[PDB]
C-alpha cells in the first residue's frame, strides 16, 4: 500500500514538477510517508551545496522534535531491513550523499571547506540521532574527508574542530588498524600546526586534560556542544581512544608545551562560563607541571591578567595563589613577573582596572608569601628576589584600593583579598 501510494505521488509530481516541493512540504508537515519526501528531493535534481543535504540536515537538526524522531525511525527502519536491496529510496539518498562526499574530496580548498563542514554536520546528525550504521566504504570515505588538510582559514579551523569531534563521537567508525594510524598521524600533524590556534587549540587542550583526568562525561558534553546535538556515545570506544591519546598523542610534556602556546581568553569574566584555558593552566599549575617539564608560564599569566575584563572570572584568584606558590619551590620554580612589566602596567598604555587590581594583588600576595615562607628558604640570597622598594613606591596602593572599593560588586573575592593584604601589610593605609 505504501509503495503504491508513493508511486502514485511520484507519478503525480513527475506530471507536475512545479508542485513537487510543495508535496515534500506536505510530507514534512503531516509527518507522513518519509520515503516519498526523500524521493521527491532526489527526483528533483533529475551549484554549491546540494538541495538534498539542506533538506535532510533541516529534518534531522531542526528544532522540531517530532519530525526528528519520525525521520530517525525512518532511517533506522530502512537501515535494518531488506539487507541493502537498493530498492528503497534510503539507499538512493545514501548514494547521492556518497556522490557529494567524493565530489568535495580533492588538501581542501577555500570554497569547498564550508560545504565539507556542512556535510560533516549532516553525517553527525545521521550517525548520532538517526542511528545510521554506515557501510565500510562510507566510513572509509568519511575518514578520508575527516583527515583532510584545510588551508588554515577560519572555515578550516571550524572544519578541523568538527572532524576532531566526529572522531571522538564516532570512533567506532574507525574499527581498523590502518585508519587508526592514519588518525594518529593526522593528529600529530594537527599538533605541529600553529596557525590553527590564533578556538581549536583551546578545545584540544581541554580534551587533553579531560582524558588525563578521566573526565569522560565532560568530553561528551563538549563534543555535543561543538557538533550541536545530543548523541549516545558508549564511552568504551572512548576509553580506547583515551588510552591511545594519553599514551602517544598527549603526554604531559607535549600538553604543557601546547598549553603555553594556547591563546589567552580575551576579556574573560564571570559572564563567559564553561571550562576555559585558565582552568587548564590552573590544573596544570596545581600539578607543578610547568616547572617539572621546564616550561615557561610567566608570559602567559601576564598576558591573561592584562586581558581581563571588568567582572571577575572566579578562577583568577586561585590561579594567582597557585602561581605564587609555584614561584616558591626550592630545587626549581617558576619565574616571577619582570619588574619592568608592573612598572609599565601601573604607569600614570591603557589597561583594564582589573588588570591593575590583579597585578597589585599579585605583588602584595607575593611579598606577603615571601615574608611568610622564609623559614624554608634553602637557596641563595637572590633566589627569593624580593621586589625593589622603588617598585613599591611607584605603585598607587591607596588609589587602586579606592578604585576597588568603588567597583566592589564586580570583583568578588578580589576586594576581600586586597583588604586583607592591605590590613596585614600596610596598616598605615588603613587609618
Amino acid at each position: 500500500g505504501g509503495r503504491r501510494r508513493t508511486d502514485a505521488l511520484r507519478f503525480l509530481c513527475k506530471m507536475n514538477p512545479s508542485q513537487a516541493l510543495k508535496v515534500r512540504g506536505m510530507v514534512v508537515e503531516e509527518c507522513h510517508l518519509p520515503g516519498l519526501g526523500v524521493a521527491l528531493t532526489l527526483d528533483h535534481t533529475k551549484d554549491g551545496v546540494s538541495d538534498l543535504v539542506c533538506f535532510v540536515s533541516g529534518l534531522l537538526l531542526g528544532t522540531n522534535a517530532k519530525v526528528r524522531t519520525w525521520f530517525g525511525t525512518f532511517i533506522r527502519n530502512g537501515q535494518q531491513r531488506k539487507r541493502e536491496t537498493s530498492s528503497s529510496v534510503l539507499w538512493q539518498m545514501r548514494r547521492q550523499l556518497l556522490l557529494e562526499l567524493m565530489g568535495i574530496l580533492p588538501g581542501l580548498k577555500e570554497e569547498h571547506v564550508v560545504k565539507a563542514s556542512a556535510l560533516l554536520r549532516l553525517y553527525c546528525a545521521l550517525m548520532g540521532i538517526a542511528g545510521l550504521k554506515p557501510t565500510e566504504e562510507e566510513a572509509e570515505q568519511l575518514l578520508q574527508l575527516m583527515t583532510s588538510r584545510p588551508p588554515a582559514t577560519p572555515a578550516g579551523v571550524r572544519f578541523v574542530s568538527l572532524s576532531f569531534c566526529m572522531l571522538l563521537a564516532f570512533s567506532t567508525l574507525v574499527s581498523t588498524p590502518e585508519q587508526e594510524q592514519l588518525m594518529v598521524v593526522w593528529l600529530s600533524w594537527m599538533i605541529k600546526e600553529e596557525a590553527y590556534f590564533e578556538s581549536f587549540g583551546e578545545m584540544l587542550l581541554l580534551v587533553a586534560m579531560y582524558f588525563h583526568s578521566n573526565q569522560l562525561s565532560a568530553i561528551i558534553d563538549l563534543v555535543c556542544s561543538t557538533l550541536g546535538m545530543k548523541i549516545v556515545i558508549k564511552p568504551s570506544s572512548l576509553s580506547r581512544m583515551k588510552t591511545i591519546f594519553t599514551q602517544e598523542i598527549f603526554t604531559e610534556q607535549v600538553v604543557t608545551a601546547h598549553a603555553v602556546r594556547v591563546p589567552v581568553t580575551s576579556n574573560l569574566s564571570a559572564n563567559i562560563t564553561g571550562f576555559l584555558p585558565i582552568h587548564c593552566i590552573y590544573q596544570l599549575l596545581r600539578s607543578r607541571s610547568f616547572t617539572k617539564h621546564k616550561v615557561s608560564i610567566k608570559d602567559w599569566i601576564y598576558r591573561q591578567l592584562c586581558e581581563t575584563s571588568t567582572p571577575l572570572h572566579p578562577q583568577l584568584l586561585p590561579l594567582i595563589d597557585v602561581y605564587i606558590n609555584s614561584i616558591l619551590t626550592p630545587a626549581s620554580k617558576s619565574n616571577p613577573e619582570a619588574t619592568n612589566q608592573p612598572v609599565t602596567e601601573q604607569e600614570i598604555q591603557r589597561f583594564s582596572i582589573t588588570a591593575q587590581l590583579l597585578v597589585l594583588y599579585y605583588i602584595l600576595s607575593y611579598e606577603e608569601a615571601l615574608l611568610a615562607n622564609t623559614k624554608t628558604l634553602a637557596a641563595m640570597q637572590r633566589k627569593p628576589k624580593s621586589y625593589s622598594s622603588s617598585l613599591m613606591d611607584q605603585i598607587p596602593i591607596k588609589f587602586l584600593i579606592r578604585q576597588a572599593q568603588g567597583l566592589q560588586q564586580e570583583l568578588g573575592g578580589l576586594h576581600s583579598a586586597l583588604l586583607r593584604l592591605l590590613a596585614t601589610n600596610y596598616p598605615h593605609l588603613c587609618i
Binding site: 533538506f55 533541516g58 570554497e111 566592589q408 593584604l421 590590613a423
Partner: protein, 886 residues
C-alpha cells in the same frame, strides 16, 4: 551552601587579627547576593552588628561599607530592634570616630528604622558636637532621616535654621548643612517654612558657593513640592538676569533646564518672555548657549503652545539661527523648527523658509571640520531637517535639493549623517525617486577612494539611500554597484549589510547577487545555510517581478517559479537552526509566505477552473465545484490570516515596523478572503460601506504605502461589484486574479526582526514536578518563573503581567480551565493553582504564560509546558467504592 559560607565568615570574624576580620566582613555582601535567604540575612546582620559593637574603628568602617552596599537586604531583617540596639550602643563611646561611624550606620539604616526616636535624638545631639567628623556624620545621617521621616524633618528644620543663623558654625559646615532642606517635601507648611529659610539664606549669605548651594537645593525642594514651582522659576529667572556672577547664572541656567525637563507645562508665558529677554540681552555666548538650550527644551514640549505671532521668542530664534557660534545656531534653529511644526498660523508661512535656509547654513557650516562638536551640531540640524520635512511635507523638495547639492562636498562622516537624514526623508515620501537616485549614483562612483575607516559605513549608508530612492529594476546600475563592491570593499560585512538593506527595501535581484557572492567566504555551516537561504528567498521574490497585469498564465508560471526557490530556501533556513538563536520568527514568517503563495496559486488555478471545468447537468448551486473550491479557498485564507495573527502575537520582541509588516501580510490575507466572500459566497448579506478615514493613513514606508494603495483599490473594485453579476461570472474571476497579481507585484520587504533580534525575553517557568496523587487530595501546584532579558529589559515593550493559563486533559477534556494574572514585582512571579483529578485515570497538565504589556496587549510568548499526573484512589476508598457500587 548558605550555612557553610556563613560559618566560614564567622570563623574569619573571630580570627582576632584585623586582616581576616576585615576580609570576612567585606565578604558578607557577596554572600547576601549568593543566598538571599531572610533567616541567613537576619543572622548574618546580627553577627555583623555584634562585631560592630566590639571591634576597632576600621572594622566598623568595613561594616558601614557592607551596610551601604547591602541596603536592599536590610528589608529582610526581622530582629530589627536587637540589631539596632547593639549598633546604637556605641554612640555612647567617648571616641568621636566611633560615634561618627555609628551616625553613618544609622544613616544607612534610615530606610528600615525611621521613626526610632532615640536615633533622632542622637542625630540632634551629635549635630552640635565639637569633633568635625562627628558633625559631618550627624549631617549625613540627618540627610537620610529627613529623606525618610516626616517627624524628623519637621523636628530638624528648626535646628538647621538656627545652626545656619548661628555664628559659631563655619562657612563650610553651613554649606554642607543647607542641602538637608531638599528633603523637606513631606508637607506644605514644612516646604513653605523651608522656602522662607532659603530666601533668608540667599539674602544674608550672598557668597557664590552659598547662593549656588542654597538656590540649587531650593530648586530641588520646589521640584519635589510642586506648589512652589512657579515662584522657583521666577526666582531663577530673576537671579539669571540680575546676579552678575557667571557661576550663579550658569546654575540658574542648569537648574531651569532641570525644571523645564520635568515640569514644562507649569512654565508661563511671562517666564518664557523673561528668559527670552535674558537671552537677547546677554553678551556671553556660553550663557546664551545655556538659556537657548533651555528654550529648545521648552519648545520641544507644549510650553510653546502655552506661550502663544511675532514675539521676543521668534526674534530670538531668528537672530540666533545665524549666529557665528555653531551651538547657538543649532539650538536657535531647533527652536525655529519646533515653532514651525507646532502651529499653522499665516505669519508662520514666512517663518518656515527662514528655518529652511537656517538648516541650509548649518549644513554648510558643520560639514567640513569633522570635530565631535560639529557632529553634535550636525545631528541636531539633521534631526530638525527630518522633523520639519515630516511635519510640513510641502517643504521637503527644497530640503532634499539642498541635501543633494551638499552631499558632494561634505566630509565622510557628514556624508553618513546626511545619507541617514535623506533616507528618512525618502522613506517618508516616494515622489522623488529616479532623479535623486541618479545623483546619489554619480556620487556612488567616487566612494572607492574616499578614506579607509568611514568608507565602509559610507558605502552602507549610500547604498541604503540608493535602495530607498529606487522603486524599480536596475541592471547597469546594479553592475556599477557590484563592481564598486568587488573593487573596494572585499570585506563582506559591508556587502552583507548592503544586501540586508536591499532585502528591506524590496530590491531583491541585486540582493540575490550579493548574497550569492557571500557563500564562499563564510566559515560556519549555520551561517552558510542562512546566507544560502537568503539567496534563495531573494531569488524567489525576484521571480515575482516578472508578473504582468491581466496575464494569469504568466502569473501561474511566475508563482510556481517563485515557490520552487522559496521551498529550497525554507529547507536551507530550517537547516540553519541551532539550540542557540533558533530562527523561529524567520522559519514561521517564511512558512506563512509559503502558504500564502500556495493559496494564491490555488486561487488562480480555481479561477481558471471556472472555465476549465464547466458545471454538470444540475438544474451557490448549479456551479457546485467552483463554489465548493471557492469555499475551500475562503477557509484557507482565513486560516492564513489567523496564522499571521498568532505569529504577530508570538512576536513580542519585534520592533514596531516588523509588527506592522506582519500586520500587512495578515490584512492582505483578510482582503483576499473578504473579496472571495463578497463576490462569490455571501454577496447579499455583505452590505458593508467602506467608510474609513483614509486621509489619515500615515504610511510609514514606501512598501506600506503600496500595500494600502492596493488594499484600497481591491476594496473599491469589490464595492463596485457588490450585486451587479451572478456570483460565478468571469468578472469575479478577473477581479480576484487582478487582486492577487496586484498584491504580488509589490515585492516583499523583510524587516529588522527577521535579520536582527533585540530585546530578547523568556520564561524559565519552574513548577512542582508520571506523578501520582490521591484523588481526594486534589493537587496543589506552585508555579513560578523569572523573566530573562537580553541587555536592557524594556527597550520596545514593557512587561507588567503574566497571564498564566492552565488546562487539563484525560487519556493523554478541558476540565481545569483556570488562569491567574500576576505582576512579577521583582522580575520573578510566583503563584499557586489547585487542580482537581476526581477522575481516577491519568491527567496531562498544560500550563501557558501569556504576557499583557503596559498598553493591555496580550502576547502568547511564554513556553508551552506539559507534565503528566497520575490520579488514583487509595485501596480502602477503592474497596468501599466497589462494595458500594453494587
Amino acid at each position: 551552601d548558605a550555612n557553610s559560607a556563613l560559618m566560614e565568615l564567622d570563623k574569619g570574624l573571630r580570627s582576632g587579627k584585623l586582616g581576616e576580620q576585615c576580609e570576612a566582613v567585606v565578604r558578607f555582601p557577596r554572600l547576601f547576593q549568593k543566598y538571599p535567604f531572610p533567616i541567613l540575612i537576619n543572622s548574618a546582620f546580627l553577627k555583623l552588628a555584634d562585631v560592630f559593637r566590639v571591634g576597632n574603628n576600621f572594622l566598623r568602617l568595613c561594616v558601614l561599607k557592607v551596610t551601604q552596599q547591602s541596603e536592599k537586604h536590610l528589608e529582610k531583617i526581622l530582629n530589627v530592634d536587637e540589631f539596632v540596639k547593639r549598633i546604637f550602643s556605641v554612640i555612647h563611646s567617648n571616641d568621636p570616630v566611633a560615634r561618627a561611624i555609628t551616625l553613618r550606620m544609622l544613616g544607612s539604616l534610615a530606610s528600615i528604622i525611621p521613626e526610632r526616636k532615640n536615633a533622632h535624638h542622637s542625630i540632634r545631639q551629635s549635630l552640635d558636637s565639637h569633633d568635625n567628623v562627628e558633625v559631618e556624620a550627624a549631617v549625613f545621617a540627618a540627610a537620610n532621616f529627613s529623606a525618610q521621616s516626616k517627624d524628623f524633618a519637621v523636628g530638624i528644620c528648626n535646628k538647621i535654621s538656627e545652626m545656619i543663623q548661628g555664628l559659631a558654625t563655619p562657612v563650610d559646615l553651613k554649606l554642607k548643612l543647607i542641602p538637608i532642606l531638599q528633603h523637606m517635601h513631606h508637607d506644605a507648611i514644612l516646604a513653605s517654612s523651608a522656602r522662607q529659610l532659603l530666601q533668608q539664606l540667599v539674602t544674608s549669605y550672598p557668597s557664590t558657593k552659598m547662593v549656588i548651594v542654597s538656590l540649587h537645593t531650593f530648586t530641588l525642594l520646589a521640584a519635589s513640592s510642586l506648589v512652589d514651582t512657579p515662584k522657583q522659576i521666577q526666582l531663577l529667572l530673576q537671579y539669571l538676569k540680575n546676579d552678575p556672577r557667571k557661576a550663579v547664572k550658569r546654575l540658574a541656567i542648569q537648574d531651569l533646564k532641570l525644571l523645564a525637563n520635568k515640569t514644562p507645562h507649569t512654565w508661563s508665558r511671562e517666564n518664557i518672555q523673561a528668559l527670552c529677554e535674558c537671552a537677547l540681552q546677554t553678551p556671553y555666548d556660553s550663557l546664551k548657549l545655556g538659556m537657548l538650550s533651555v528654550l529648545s527644551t521648552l519648545s520641544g514640549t507644549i510650553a510653546i503652545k502655552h506661550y502663544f505671532r511675532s514675539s521676543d521668542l521668534v526674534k530670538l530664534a531668528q537672530e540666533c539661527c545665524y549666529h557665528n557660534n555653531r551651538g547657538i545656531a543649532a539650538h536657535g534653529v531647533r527652536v525655529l523648527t519646533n515653532i514651525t511644526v507646532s502651529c499653522q498660523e499665516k505669519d508662520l508661512l514666512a517663518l518656515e523658509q527662514d528655518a529652511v535656509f537656517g538648516l541650509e547654513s548649518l549644513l554648510v557650516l558643520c560639514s567640513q571640520d569633522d570635530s565631535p562638536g560639529a557632529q553634535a551640531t550636525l545631528k541636531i540640524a539633521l534631526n530638525c531637517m527630518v522633523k520639519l520635512a515630516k511635519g510640513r511635507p510641502h517643504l521637503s523638495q527644497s530640503v532634499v535639493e539642498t541635501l543633494l547639492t551638499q552631499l558632494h562636498s561634505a566630509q565622510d562622516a557628514a556624508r553618513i549623517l546626511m545619507c541617514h537624514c535623506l533616507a528618512a526623508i525618502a522613506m517618508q515620501l516616494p515622489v522623488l525617486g529616479d532623479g535623486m537616485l541618479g545623483d546619489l549614483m554619480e556620487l556612488y562612483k567616487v566612494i572607492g577612494r574616499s578614506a579607509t575607516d568611514k568608507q565602509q559605513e559610507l558605502l552602507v549608508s549610500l547604498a541604503t539611500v540608493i535602495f530607498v530612492a529606487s522603486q524599480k529594476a536596475l541592471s547597469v546600475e546594479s553592475k556599477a554597484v557590484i563592481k564598486q563592491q568587488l573593487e573596494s570593499v572585499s570585506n563582506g560585512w559591508t556587502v552583507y549589510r548592503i544586501a540586508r538593506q536591499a532585502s528591506r527595501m524590496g530590491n531583491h535581484d541585486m540582493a540575490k547577487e550579493l548574497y550569492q557572492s557571500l557563500l564562499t567566504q563564510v566559515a560556519s555551516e549555520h551561517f552558510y545555510f542562512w546566507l544560502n537561504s537568503l539567496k534563495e528567498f531573494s531569488h524567489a521574490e525576484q521571480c515575482l517581478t516578472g508578473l504582468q497585469e491581466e496575464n494569469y498564465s504568466s502569473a501561474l508560471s511566475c508563482i510556481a517559479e517563485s515557490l520552487k526557490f522559496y521551498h529550497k530556501g525554507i529547507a536551507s533556513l530550517t537547516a540553519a537552526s541551532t539550540p542557540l538563536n533558533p530562527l523561529s520568527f524567520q522559519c514561521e514568517f517564511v512558512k506563512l509566505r509559503i502558504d500564502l503563495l500556495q493559496a494564491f496559486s490555488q486561487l488562480i488555478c480555481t479561477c481558471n477552473s471556472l472555465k476549465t471545468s464547466p458545471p454538470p447537468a444540475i438544474a451557490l448551486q448549479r456551479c457546485g465545484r467552483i463554489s465548493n473550491q471557492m469555499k475551500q479557498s475562503m477557509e484557507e485564507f482565513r486560516s492564513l490570516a489567523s496564522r499571521y495573527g498568532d505569529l504577530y502575537q508570538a512576536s513580542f520582541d519585534a520592533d514596531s515596523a516588523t509588527l506592522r509588516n506582519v500586520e500587512l501580510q495578515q490584512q492582505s490575507c483578510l482582503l483576499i478572503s473578504h473579496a472571495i466572500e463578497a463576490l462569490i459566497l455571501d454577496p447579499e448579506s455583505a452590505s458593508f460601506q467602506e467608510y474609513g478615514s483614509t486621509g489619515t493613513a500615515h504610511a510609514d514606508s514606501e512598501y506600506e504605502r503600496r500595500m494600502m494603495s492596493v488594499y484600497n483599490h481591491v476594496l473599491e473594485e469589490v464595492e463596485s461589484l457588490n450585486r451587479k453579476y451572478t456570483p460565478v461570472s468571469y468578472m469575479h474571476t478577473a477581479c480576484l486574479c487582478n487582486a492577487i497579481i496586484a498584491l504580488l507585484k509589490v515585492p516583499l520587504s523583510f524587516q529588522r526582526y527577521f535579520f536582527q533580534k533585540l530585546q530578547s525575553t523568556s520564561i524559565k517557568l519552574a513548577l512542582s514536578p508520571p506523578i501520582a496523587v490521591q484523588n481526594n487530595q486534589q493537587l496543589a501546584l506552585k508555579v513560578e518563573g523569572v523573566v530573562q532579558h537580553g541587555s536592557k529589559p524594556g527597550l520596545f515593550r514593557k512587561i507588567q503581567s503574566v497571564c498564566l493559563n492552565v488546562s487539563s486533559t484525560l487519556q493523554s477534556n478541558m476540565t481545569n480551565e483556570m488562569e491567574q494574572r500576576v505582576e512579577p514585582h521583582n522580575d520573578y512571579f510566583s503563584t499557586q493553582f489547585l487542580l482537581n483529578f476526581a477522575i481516577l485515570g491519568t491527567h496531562n497538565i498544560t500550563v501557558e504564560s501569556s504576557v499583557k504589556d503596559a498598553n493591555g496587549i496580550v502576547w502568547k510568548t511564554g513556553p508551552r509546558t506539559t507534565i503528566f499526573v497520575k490520579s488514583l484512589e487509595d485501596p480502602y476508598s477503592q474497596q468501599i467504592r466497589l462494595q458500594q457500587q453494587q
